[PDB]
Design a protein that fits this description.
2 copies of one chain form a homodimer.
Chain A: E1 6-9, E2 15-20, H1 30-44, E3 47-58, E4 61-69, E5 74-75, E6 78-80, H2 87-99, E7 110-120, E8 140-148, E9 153-158, E10 161-167, H3 168-171, H4 175-182, H5 185-189, E11 193-196
Parallel strand pairs in A: 1-11, 2-9, 3-8
Antiparallel strand pairs in A: 3-4, 3-6, 4-5, 4-10, 7-8
Bound molecules: the ligand C[C@@]1(Cc2cc(-c3ccccc3)no2)NC(=O)CC1=O (2 copies) and zinc ion (ZN) (4 copies).
Amino acid sequence: SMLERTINLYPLTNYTFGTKEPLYEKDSSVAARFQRMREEFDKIGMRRTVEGVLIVHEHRLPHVLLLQLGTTFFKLPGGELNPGEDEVEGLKRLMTEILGRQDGVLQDWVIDDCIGNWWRPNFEPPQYPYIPAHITKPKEHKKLFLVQLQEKALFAVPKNYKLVAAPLFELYDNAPGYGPIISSLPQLLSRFNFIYN
Amino acid sequence: SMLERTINLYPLTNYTFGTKEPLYEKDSSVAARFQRMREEFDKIGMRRTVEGVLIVHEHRLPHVLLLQLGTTFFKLPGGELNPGEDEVEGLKRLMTEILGRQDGVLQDWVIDDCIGNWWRPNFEPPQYPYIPAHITKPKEHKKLFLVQLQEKALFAVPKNYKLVAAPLFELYDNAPGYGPIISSLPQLLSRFNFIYN
Ligand SMILES: C[C@@]1(Cc2cc(-c3ccccc3)no2)NC(=O)CC1=O
Ligand SMILES: C[C@@]1(Cc2cc(-c3ccccc3)no2)NC(=O)CC1=O
Ligand SMILES: [Zn+2]
Ligand SMILES: [Zn+2]
Ligand SMILES: [Zn+2]
Ligand SMILES: [Zn+2]
């Protein structure tokens, strides 16, 4: 009857958030983003994106680490796989790129849980947790993984981003604030047995 | 990188839906429902409810089996555990009670996946996929399980219910139609690798 995965959470105060050089997006606008998505689809097919969910707590209240581009959109650490790249090795690479330390000490990322899939049917913003009706060639597949943090870690945040610890109640039913993926993280995390260490 | 659970789905046409005597709710109204919930909380503490998600497909389109009380509210097969009752044995008991055959042939329910948790903080309708802030004594804990169906099965539907096969797109973002639990099932099922048999 214990069919739940057990996940160790540690206090937000256990983690050190340093700073490093800005990390710039490949697209300077939504228009460019969808242009490049069109160009790559015609060369190498469906975009494969991976996103990591990193959880901490304070006073046994779970928080998801989000990356805020200045004071704009919130995103999960993650991004685009290269063609032929393993999903898990790819997320470890992208999370090292985004939050990895300047002193070049290896963070040990542990990824043992897929927590969802999202599909983009067109070169447009709408994404669904399923392939919609009549769609044979989705333009993007996004896969979310739960990342088990070590007890303590040093993270280097690119100077152009803020790292925010978002409590679940704030995500819940707040698609306008966070979009349909991050806003459904409370539902997607409810199945886990969190230890508050 | 295959961290997904693999789930066999079969066609809706593989399953036989017979009929049996009505199965009446213990509460004749929302008011009675919350009254009885108050009375039991003071005797035996937090209500423990279990709900099963049974999935089929037609033409590789996944459908969740819902029970419609006449033409009213949609519910998952499930209900209240007795004090000291195992969650999994309890859901098998409740699903036998609701959909079990009249000829008293055993359905073999396979339950290997928790897909979420919901908490009712007050004797009121609101439920959250987490224990809300300042709540030490939640009044109900609801646990959802994915039920792996056999290739073929005979189900006996109580005459006062309809068994509806609901496609995911219809559930998605339709809390008004289905409430916050069923409406978030597409997100909660997205992590599974469905085989369409
Ligand atoms: C190639 C790369 C690498 C990348 C990831 C991030 C990033 C993701 C999440 C939070 C903060 C930063 N910025 O650049 N460039 C892009 O424009 C998308 C992408 O995958
Ligand atoms: C004790 C019991 C048994 C039960 C379950 C169902 C039922 C659930 C889902 C779909 C269709 C029918 N109706 O009665 N009586 C109640 O009033 C709640 C409960 O747990
Ligand atoms: Zn504390
Ligand atoms: Zn795909
Ligand atoms: Zn077919
Ligand atoms: Zn509980």
